Design a protein around this ligand. Structure first.
Ligand SMILES: N=C(N)NCCCCN
Length: 215
């Protein structure tokens, strides 16, 4: 996991790489994409992901109201747009917070299911930015830095945004664990994208709630 652990590259080099990825993204386009779809994706990266991901993670969305209908529409529009954007395959990174109770159970070959959209960056510097602050919660959480091998599901949204080199998955993405390294304050987890329907005879867990997902 030294790609993650090592010191960040300079602003200049990271900004350059992000710009090159944005360029590659645009160059790799799509003609079917709507104005509402481009606009939803631009908004997504800045603020929209906050509402969409809360909706996707919510135990009870009967309480949301008119805002639920808007959230469903937004999610549908973002998923539709994603399918029209260029695929990315290669390595990407994501920093997040996970229940220690789940982390304690995890082994290589277990599958993690993200109920929200999954946003990753090709730049570990950018990934590390989004997990700096410890959230407040009833739950004991620990910082997790994922190294993600992407061979399906990931689409670049960097063409439509930003120096984030962002690659996005639709909700319910499944990730098979290939390696775990546990330390104090940081757990590193290597994962590979897998198709849900190809997951057999292993244990799946919901990455947010920590609950087992039915085989
Ligand atoms: N990596 C996270 N924890 N969050 C991703 C935020 C997505 C912003 N474009």
């Amino acid at each position: 996991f030294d790609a993650i652990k090592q010191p960040n590259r300079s602003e200049e080099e990271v900004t350059q790489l992000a710009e090159d990825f944005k360029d590659w993204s645009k160059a790799s386009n799509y003609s079917f994409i709507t104005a509402n779809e481009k606009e939803a994706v631009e908004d997504f990266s800045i603020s929209g992901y906050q509402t969409a991901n809360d909706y996707l993670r919510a135990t009870d969305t009967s309480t949301w109201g008119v805002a639920g209908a808007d959230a469903r529409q937004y999610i549908r529009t973002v998923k539709s747009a994603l399918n029209k954007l260029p695929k990315y395959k290669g390595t990407a990174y994501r920093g997040t917070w996970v229940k220690l109770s789940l982390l304690n159970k995890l082994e290589e070959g277990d599958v993690l299911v993200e109920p929200a959209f999954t946003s990753t960056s090709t730049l570990p510097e950018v990934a590390k930015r989004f997990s700096v602050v410890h959230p407040n919660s009833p739950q004991r959480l620990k910082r997790v830095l994922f190294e993600v091998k992407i061979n399906q599901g990931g689409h670049t949204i960097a063409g439509l945004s930003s120096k984030e080199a962002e690659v996005l998955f639709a909700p319910n993405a499944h990730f098979r664990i290939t390696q775990i390294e546990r330390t104090s304050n940081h757990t590193y987890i290597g994962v590979e994208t897998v198709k849900a329907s190809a997951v057999k005879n292993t244990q799946k867990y919901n990455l947010y709630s920590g609950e087992e997902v039915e085989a």
